[PDB]
Amino acid sequence: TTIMAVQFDGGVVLGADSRTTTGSYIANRVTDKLTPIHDRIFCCRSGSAADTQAVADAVTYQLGFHSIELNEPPLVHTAASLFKEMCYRYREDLMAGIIIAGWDPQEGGQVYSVPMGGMMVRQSFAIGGSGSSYIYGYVDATYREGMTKEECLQFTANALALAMERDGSSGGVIRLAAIAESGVERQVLLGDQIPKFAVA
Amino acid sequence: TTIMAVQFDGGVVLGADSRTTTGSYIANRVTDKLTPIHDRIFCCRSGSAADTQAVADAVTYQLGFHSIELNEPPLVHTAASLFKEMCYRYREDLMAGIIIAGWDPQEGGQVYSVPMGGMMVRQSFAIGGSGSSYIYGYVDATYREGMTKEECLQFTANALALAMERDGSSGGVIRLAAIAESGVERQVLLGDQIPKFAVA
Amino acid sequence: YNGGAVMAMKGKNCVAIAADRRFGIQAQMVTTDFQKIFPMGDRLYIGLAGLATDVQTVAQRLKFRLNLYELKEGRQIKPYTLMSMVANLLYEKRFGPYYTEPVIAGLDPKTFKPFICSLDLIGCPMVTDDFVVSGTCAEQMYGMCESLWEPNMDPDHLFETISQAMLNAVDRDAVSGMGVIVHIIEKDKITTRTLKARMD
Amino acid sequence: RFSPYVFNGGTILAIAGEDFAIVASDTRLSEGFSIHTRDSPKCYKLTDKTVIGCSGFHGDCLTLTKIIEARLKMYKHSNNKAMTTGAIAAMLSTILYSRRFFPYYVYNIIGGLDEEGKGAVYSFDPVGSYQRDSFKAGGSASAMLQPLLDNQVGFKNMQNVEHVPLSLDRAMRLVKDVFISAAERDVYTGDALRICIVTKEGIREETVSLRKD
Amino acid sequence: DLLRKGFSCVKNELLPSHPLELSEKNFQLNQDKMNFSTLRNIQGLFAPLKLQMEFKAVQQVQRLPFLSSSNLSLDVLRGNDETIGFEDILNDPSQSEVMGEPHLMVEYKLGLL
Amino acid sequence: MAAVSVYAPPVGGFSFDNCRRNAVLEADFAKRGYKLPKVRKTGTTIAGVVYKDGIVLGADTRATEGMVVADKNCSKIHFISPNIYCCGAGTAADTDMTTQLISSNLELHSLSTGRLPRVVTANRMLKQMLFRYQGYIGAALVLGGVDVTGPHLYSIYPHGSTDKLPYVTMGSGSLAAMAVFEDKFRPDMEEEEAKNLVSEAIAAGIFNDLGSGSNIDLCVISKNKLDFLRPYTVPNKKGTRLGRYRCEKGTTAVLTEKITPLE
Amino acid sequence: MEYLIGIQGPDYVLVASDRVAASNIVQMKDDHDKMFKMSEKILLLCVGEAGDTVQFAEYIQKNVQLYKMRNGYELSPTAAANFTRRNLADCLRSRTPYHVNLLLAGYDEHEGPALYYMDYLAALAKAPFAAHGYGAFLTLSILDRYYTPTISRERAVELLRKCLEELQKRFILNLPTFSVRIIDKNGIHDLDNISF
Amino acid sequence: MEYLIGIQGPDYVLVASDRVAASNIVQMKDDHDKMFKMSEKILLLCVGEAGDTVQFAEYIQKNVQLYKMRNGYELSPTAAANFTRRNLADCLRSRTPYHVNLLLAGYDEHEGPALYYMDYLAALAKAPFAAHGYGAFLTLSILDRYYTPTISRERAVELLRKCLEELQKRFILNLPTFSVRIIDKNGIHDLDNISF
Amino acid sequence: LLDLGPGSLSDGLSLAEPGIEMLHGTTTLAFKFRHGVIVAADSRATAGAYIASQTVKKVIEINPYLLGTMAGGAADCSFWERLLARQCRIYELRNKERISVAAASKLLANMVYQYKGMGLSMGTMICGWDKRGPGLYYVDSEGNRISGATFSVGSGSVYAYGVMDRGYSYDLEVEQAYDLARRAIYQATYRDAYSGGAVNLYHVREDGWIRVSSDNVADLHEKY
Amino acid sequence: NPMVTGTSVLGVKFEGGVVIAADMLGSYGSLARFRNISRIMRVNNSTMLGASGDYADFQYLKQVLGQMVIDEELLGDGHSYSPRAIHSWLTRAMYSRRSKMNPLWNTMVIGGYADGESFLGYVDMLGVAYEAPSLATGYGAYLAQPLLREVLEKQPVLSQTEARDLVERCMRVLYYRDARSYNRFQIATVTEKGVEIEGPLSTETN
């Protein structure tokens, strides 16, 4: 579980692994952790599967209803606030850490990083989940400003590969999503395509 | 606590932070975590301070006596085995993780990585302590083979800076030591000299 | 605690239901005439096994519902339906379980086809073709019936088999016994016999 | 934090006739919800006239069976004769009790011939209270086996029936059938059935098949 | 300080019988609050006011409390006319199985006692 | 006579009350006692695949009370809707009642709608129920079916989480069953191939597990055909009985006898 | 604790209870009438933990009296026993029941004498004789020994005296007096207290 | 539990203990001589938990006898009390002491009568009268009431009878008999058992 | 070599569910009328709720001078009276006189006093005809050692106390005492659930115990 | 309590010897800390060994168990520790360590080929020792043992190539469905010729 998101110029690039452990056994190994809240807004789920899934479904309900009432695409900040409310009122009963990220006409690509607890804060890049501890340093050292879509994708793939090789609760295939004005361009990095770093 | 060691061609470069927390308060902030076991052999101490200090003193006793009896500089593997014995017989009563590293005429620069528990394993580069989790990915991504002394020092400084900025049990000044055939060339990176990475 | 044991056995248009007669508090026999087989129809009995305080309650919780059912629909209940409302009554208290494991045995009123079943304390229909058991002596009846049972046994041989199963299973359990009651339901008549058991 | 014990399962059964002493056991070694192996017999041959069968924690089964063999050899050396069945049983009670405060989690049944050649079976407990019985069963399935043996061997609770002495052929039939029944309902029993027939002519072994699931 | 009714106290009880005691017993009101917060936040205050305003006058006249009731119009006002749950099959109010004196039960409904 | 005490029992639905009796009747635990029955674990190796144009479900038929094989032919493939079936693992009663209520809800839905229900609807109903009940209803289900939008396979965990996979396995023998799938599974199998694969996968959970093992069930759901193969294979048969126990007449002693002519 | 005992003969019921009401190592009163008169022919021996015994007995007594006055006839002993059982069973939930061990003894003009045993879980059981408290262990064997279904009143009372004497001989607690009443076709009859 | 009592007069010591040895709700024996004869003029009343009382008393008795025979004279009551205290205090470590509540009563030809109280922690204290067990609470006030430093033997014995009667009146446990011995210038004197 | 089980691990001089078990003992009895002591006990031994055996000889046969009794835990008793019999025989060998019942009870009590609160569950009852007369002591696991005229220990001890007390008398002729012990044990096994089987009966007369009878409670139930 | 563990060891008999395998990783909890350690020993010229669980204890065994082999080979009489003998000695060592409540937290799989008959033994931390044609430790016992036993029940005697391929397939299954696993495993094969360890072997999957 190493969900990751970066804001580039004009949009956002998500990123997640696919591994749902129930202890040391791999219950599901091709999990899609990129639940689409809206047409151009995504969330990343970390923690207990049930809580995040239910929260994402409730939020997509509320946000679809809100978007219909306003007759406009919703702002990413609106979805972030909707996640914050549910994750904060029930902070004791939930174990969800969400990385809401998407694009809207007003503010461009946005990445909000609602952690376990109910915070809502904007980030130039946000990572979460169990394996994020092993790539904090890498993302701090390598992130720059003004990155294009392609090198953002490469950066995300590298960070996720570094995390999955180290953490046991993280592995499998890397699911990416490059949200922009035009639309989401999903891809899956599998087998050989995952960047490999020569072990000593 | 982010002790670190890398084997370059012809010798080894150590590395450690200087921060001894007793909770959330900084009991000592210029701690020298590079205890010299011998003339050209070093250890790095992680965990409870008392256990590592006592173990290092016992090992330097035994190793000095052994070196006198053999009338030769000791092999780094000998010091590693001496650490392994003490850390394994009393594995229940100790909380020490040691990064024994040094140089000897036979096998050149060596880095052994005795963790908490009593393992003894050789590494091309070894890191430990609380903050090492935040730089596993960085060292996996950046380490190469055949690095010179200088770029090894730069690599160590970068990794330690990345760890100290993130972990609360790690910070202060960076103490380095470049063991080679000629002798140890210690240095301290303080204040401005610590590499800084632009926060978003 | 209170103890108890009941079984059922199918046959050639005849079924047999049995029970011990001990009502004791945890060591102390109090009476030897505790009722565990209740008449729920002409050819349809239910046997409870568990807490005496819940044998007496479930058998009256269920007579109430059964009488209402019979009056509302005006027909004697089929055994399968009686099985299905015991599940409802028990599953009602899913988190407040009635500590009892009923066994239902009888004949279809219009077909005279043998029927037996067994339910756990939260209610899980278990229709078997040979026999069911319940109570403290759970293993002993299983072992005896898996050996003595035969298909298509005429009623007297059925009575012999169930009598031996009781007598030899309750004798090997401390908190069940003090005599055995056996009912043989036929297409024409009901036989209720009290067997000779050790009173120790 | 460390469970010094684990239940490996396994069922044993003994019958003492007039010229024989059946000792039988399933051969399935289990742990939790897994089958380690299907060919681990739980009956060991001690002497030409005495057979022990242990069940329960397998580690203590191995240790106890090796201690027992060593003790028979020491007895043979000091006293210059093979031990009788009763002597072995008394020794086993003493050995089991020596670990009263760290018990041998094993159930043991001694089957063999006594000094006069008649059958004898001794049944134990994890700390060594032994007694002579005409038949017994221990282990996971003991609760399933013992009532049926009471009915068919001891003729309990039956009236007006001739007390025929138990013949060897009928004993084999009975043991095979009771384990066929037990394999059906007990999850720890199956995959084979090693039966040791202890007679005056030695110890001959028969092995049949049970449900493999 | 009285009785002849089971000494209405339960003070010893206080703490729920389970984390699933009060919540599961009153999930009807919990779902009402869920939907109202969904509607206050997004639809308006008019919609929760309508739902309160109607649910008032579906319960005012169904039947007297000492008799069983079906409460039809309430069910197809909430989605419950095609969604059936564990509160419909387990201990139905038709066979309430415990009743008091009619009068004494129809007064408190309005709240005389 | 409608006694004046409780105002009324106006709301059924899951007692609690009567739980503190459970809490303080340690009995089973401390004070010897310990008759105090416990519930069940039925559903021990259930598996599903998505072959070329449909779903194949499988399940063993052993139900264990404690460590004693209670039932030897306990059906674990429950009926949800004429095109949707659901295997059930976890606590027995919870799976039973949950599947029955979801079947009722679903076919009320399909009845009022007038068209075949979708699998995703049943997945949502089950997910939201289990999440509502905070996981105290331990009921692990494998949901399978074929709507107009092609075959679907879901795996619902007790806590509410659901996973949509081309192949899932659940139960005590889930891991042993997963071994066969991970090694032998290919997309776009034919009917007979998928049936053989699932039979092996359940067979793995039968011989290699203790909580499982009996006859093997299958449910082949296609776009147009629904074969509820029960029982699909009889790998294990009762060992033939050698003795002739055959309790005779008059063998038991009777103190008192009562006879009642019914008809 | 305390002690109850009941004996049912051909056409009567003999019951006896101690008179000691202890609160700690000290006893606070030695004339404790532990016996509640449900109706003209029903007696309800109640024991258990302090407070709950009296409250539950008062509740049941008021209900039996209320039924009698609302209808005109009286609850039959089996009816009173079953109603008490229903009441005690339902309280094994909220108001932590009441740990009241009961022993209902009554006579019906139609059904003959009746004695009902009830533990604190509300497990009703008719019996020819019973007892509660730790003293029951010592006396139940003696009751089994010399009891026959046909016992004259004098034989029953001397049997009760035998039980109490042996209870005095062995039981560690100090129970010096026992109130005794018999129930037959003519109401409830007080008998002379058995004292030592 | 059980009961000890001691009264010291001008030139004698009166002591009394129950005779009941209970094991559970049942009492196993009613002639339990709880009184160990240390020497010709010393008595050691020992009570407490089962097993430790008899063992500790036997140890101390054998030591007092051994000292007497090794020397020729006998331990003075104060010497016996202090030696017992030293022995009991040192065992408040390994062999979990022994929870033995003691009451040493003796006479010396030189020092006059002596009565020593000892809790299970080995806290020695001379006293004119004392008592152990839960019964001490009920009797200590009555002892305070009618006790004077100058009490004839008959007054002392009737005071003891008063204490025991009231203990019978109130104490919940059944203590029917009490062994009584007096200690004066002429050895130890048995007195008639106080029975009820 | 680490530890390498040396040999026979540890078993030398043992003499002074998960494994946790040792069967059970229950409902023993003895009184001491004028013609000697008689000892009665049932034959049942349970394991939780499951009878492991119906033919458990609970009256230990210590030596032809003296009897013991099993109760509370079968293995602990059996072992400790066995060692007590060893000690009694050694004493009789050395001093050339049979050991008195008082001495044997104190031996057993001292032996069991060590291990105090270490888990023993002994409930023994020593009986014999020593030089001083009848002998009867109740030696148990926590160190009680008390003589007495009448005793009974076990799960169903209380019921035996009842019947025995109302039947007992020191001037009771032999055949009536036999019936008294039979009745007491039978009633105890009638009420108690942990007591059953056959009622063994021993008479400790003058020199040498004898065995009276072993009747089954099933046949006694018909007898009464 | 262990700190650095190993996941699973597989082993299957075949006609002419015994092949076992174990991946190269030590988990410091949920973390793949060491990624090039070896968990396969060659005891002597007829017996190898693999182990899962605490790795420091495995190194202690390597120190000890290795040492006895030298201690006997210096004697030069010619008797050598047969595979069954090593299995028995290890069983006794861990039973003794358990009886003192200081267990050797390991579950070895001793395999060897001596006197023309193969051998495969299992020993865990509690001294549960036995023999079987196919073994597995950790989640190997759930994910790999079923395949091994399925293949063995149909064909009871395997050739070298089929056994090695079966082990490789089981390793693929473990790599897919086991959290604490790595895609670099070692296979050790013993025949009449002697112990032979190939490594590292990856898992190029589709």
UniProtKB/Swiss-Prot annotation, chain C:
Induction: Up-regulated in asthenozoospermic sperm. SUPFAM superfamilies: N-terminal nucleophile aminohydrolases (Ntn hydrolases) (SSF56235). Gene3D superfamilies: Glutamine Phosphoribosylpyrophosphate, subunit 1, domain 1 (3.60.20.10). InterPro entries: Ntn_hydrolases_N, Proteasome_beta_3, Proteasome_bsu_CS, Proteasome_sua/b, Proteasome_suB-type. The modification N6-acetyllysine is found at K72. It is found in: Cytoplasm; Nucleus. Non-catalytic component of the 20S core proteasome complex involved in the proteolytic degradation of most intracellular proteins. This complex plays numerous essential roles within the cell by associating with different regulatory particles. Associated with two 19S regulatory particles, forms the 26S proteasome and thus participates in the ATP-dependent degradation of ubiquitinated proteins. PANTHER family: METALLOPROTEASE TLDD (PTHR32194), PROTEASOME SUBUNIT BETA TYPE-3 (PTHR32194:SF10). Belongs to the peptidase T1B family. The 26S proteasome consists of a 20S proteasome core and two 19S regulatory subunits. The 20S proteasome core is a barrel-shaped complex made of 28 subunits that are arranged in four stacked rings. The two outer rings are each formed by seven alpha subunits, and the two inner rings are formed by seven beta subunits. The proteolytic activity is exerted by three beta-subunits PSMB5, PSMB6 and PSMB7. This is Proteasome subunit beta type-3.
From Swiss-Prot, chain E:
It comes from the Eukaryota. There is a cross-link at K11 (Glycyl lysine isopeptide (Lys-Gly) (interchain with G-Cter in SUMO2)). The keyword Nucleus applies. GO terms for cellular component: cytoplasm; cytosol; endoplasmic reticulum; membrane; nuclear speck; nucleus. The keyword Endoplasmic reticulum applies. GO terms for biological process: proteasome assembly. Strongly expressed from the basal layer to the granular layer of healthy epidermis, whereas in KLICK patients there is a gradual decrease of expression toward the granular layer. It is found in: Cytoplasm, Cytosol; Nucleus; Microsome membrane. A motif (High-affinity association with the preproteasome) lies at residues 40-44. Molecular chaperone essential for the assembly of standard proteasomes and immunoproteasomes. Degraded after completion of proteasome maturation. Mediates the association of 20S preproteasome with the endoplasmic reticulum. Constituent of preproteasomes, but not of mature 20S proteasomes. Within the preproteasome, may directly interact with PSMB1/beta6, PSMB4/beta7, PSMB5/beta5, PSMB6/beta1 and PSMB9/beta1i. Interaction with PSMB8/beta5i has been observed in PubMed:10973495, but not in PubMed:10926487. Forms tetramers. Belongs to the POMP/UMP1 family. This is Proteasome maturation protein. It comes from Homo sapiens. The gene is POMP. The chain holds residues 29 to 141 of 141 of the full protein.
From Swiss-Prot, chain F:
It comes from Homo sapiens (Human). InterPro entries: Ntn_hydrolases_N, Pept_T1A_subB, Proteasome_bsu_C, Proteasome_bsu_CS, Proteasome_sua/b, Proteasome_suB-type. It comes from the Eukaryota. Belongs to the peptidase T1B family. The lineage of its organism: Eukaryota, Metazoa, Chordata, Craniata, Vertebrata. One of its GO terms (cellular component) is ficolin-1-rich granule lumen. One of its GO terms (molecular function) is threonine-type endopeptidase activity. It is an enzyme of class 3 (hydrolase). The keyword Hydrolase applies. The active site is at T44 (nucleophile). CDD domains: proteasome_beta_type_7. One of its GO terms (biological process) is proteasome-mediated ubiquitin-dependent protein catabolic process. Residues 1-43 form a propeptide. Its EC number is 3.4.25.1. Component of the 20S core proteasome complex involved in the proteolytic degradation of most intracellular proteins. This complex plays numerous essential roles within the cell by associating with different regulatory particles. Associated with two 19S regulatory particles, forms the 26S proteasome and thus participates in the ATP-dependent degradation of ubiquitinated proteins. The keyword Cytoplasm applies. PANTHER family: METALLOPROTEASE TLDD, PROTEASOME SUBUNIT BETA TYPE-7. Keywords: Cytoplasm, Host-virus interaction, Hydrolase, Nucleus, Protease, Proteasome, Threonine protease, Zymogen. This is Proteasome subunit beta type-7. It holds the Pfam family Pr_beta_C. Expressed at a low level in colonic mucosa. Up-regulated in colorectal cancer tissues. It is found in: Cytoplasm; Nucleus. It catalyses: Cleavage of peptide bonds with very broad specificity.
Swiss-Prot record, chain J:
One of its GO terms (cellular component) is cytosol. Non-catalytic component of the 20S core proteasome complex involved in the proteolytic degradation of most intracellular proteins. This complex plays numerous essential roles within the cell by associating with different regulatory particles. Associated with two 19S regulatory particles, forms the 26S proteasome and thus participates in the ATP-dependent degradation of ubiquitinated proteins. It comes from Homo sapiens. This is Proteasome subunit beta type-4. The modification Phosphotyrosine is found at Y55. Induction: Up-regulated in fibrolamellar carcinomas. It is found in: Cytoplasm; Nucleus. Keywords: Acetylation, Cytoplasm, Disease variant, Host-virus interaction, Nucleus, Phosphoprotein, Proteasome. Belongs to the peptidase T1B family. The keyword Acetylation applies. One of its GO terms (biological process) is proteasome-mediated ubiquitin-dependent protein catabolic process.
